[PDB]
Amino acid sequence: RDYGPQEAANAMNRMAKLCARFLGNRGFSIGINDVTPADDLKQKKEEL
């Protein structure tokens, strides 16, 4: 809305090319630690 697209999208290309190369280099993932609650929420849930 300010500078017109030509440099605008030029940002977004930089967005992708950054993220796609970095994230995997750093890393991230799910875990069963995540989905299974540790003690706690099972008991309070039971009253819930």
Footprint on this chain of other proteins (rule: CB under 8 A): 5-6, 8-9, 12-30, 33
Give the nearest distance from C-beta 37 to other proteins in angstroms. Answer: 14
d(C-alpha 10, C-alpha 4), whole Å: 11
State how far the Cα of 15 lies from the Cα of 11, in Å rounded to an integer: 6
Q: How far is the CB of 19 from other proteins (least distance, A)?
A: 4
Angle ∠(36,26,33) on CA atoms, nearest 5: 10
Between 29 and 47, CB nearer to other proteins:
29
| Cβ closest to other proteins, residue 1 vs residue 47 | 1
